[PDB]
Amino acid sequence: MTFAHEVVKSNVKNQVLFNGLTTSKLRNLMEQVNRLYTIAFNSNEDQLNEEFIDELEYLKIKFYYEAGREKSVDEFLKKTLMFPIIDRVIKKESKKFFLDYCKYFEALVAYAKYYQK
């Protein structure tokens, strides 16, 4: 897939990144995603427990909070389809798709970090 790859090169303008996105501005999101990663990894079955569903709900809440806090994060989340992807992940309730999302978002962050001021 790696739409992250060509998207990150589509967002290099004149230089600002996503209108000035920086790696310090995604720390909380990275922490939350990492904790959900380790918790889901600890899980055995593929069916997502209702508690992990509530974790995903709070994760959605946190994306929305951060996107309301800053404009560049809002543009990043909007164009990278984070919100639609999270909605679909919540709909599917499958662990493997959540891990695939984790890998995608990690790639996004890695590209954003490699292209910086």
């Binding site: 922490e31 904790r35 380790t38 990894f41 600890n42």
Partner: protein, 205 residues
Amino acid sequence: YSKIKISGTIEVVTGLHIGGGGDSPVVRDLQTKLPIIPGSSIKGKMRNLLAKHFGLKMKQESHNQDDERVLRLFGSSEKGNIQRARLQISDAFFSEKTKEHFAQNDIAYTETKFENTINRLTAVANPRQIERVTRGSEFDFVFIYNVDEESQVEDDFENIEKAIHLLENDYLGGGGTRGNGRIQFKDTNIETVVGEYDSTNLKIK
């Protein structure tokens, strides 16, 4: 020939930061991706303290040749002497009670702690991020004692209880001077797993 077991629990008082694997991560297993306290760390720390309790000279400080009785307790087999270790330390593993407790109270396992340095005559900060094992977690340990001779077991466990006390008032891990690494010991259990020796009069605080 018998083997006496020691089992218990390390309580994490303040943060603990081994970080052998490293922003600056800590040591973690790979079957559960939950942190551990390597046994080498515990063994080295106790050896250092218990050596320091006895005599320690500069020439003795030279090439890790230590007092004869600590040497007996932890084994050297270097100076033409027959000494295999008599006390085995295993690793500590992030316990089940801790996992359940943090799951049903919704608290993470690791804190990410930001640190700065303020340069002299410069007043400019350079930040750091240090990740540490969250407080109040408990790890479980198991030790094994071998009785190579009958008439040093009481004395050796006197030494070990002294060492455990010293650890209870010291730090294990990294950056212990700056407020992380104090630990405590609970639920000591003493059994003779293989052999015909009694484990009733023997105690560790």
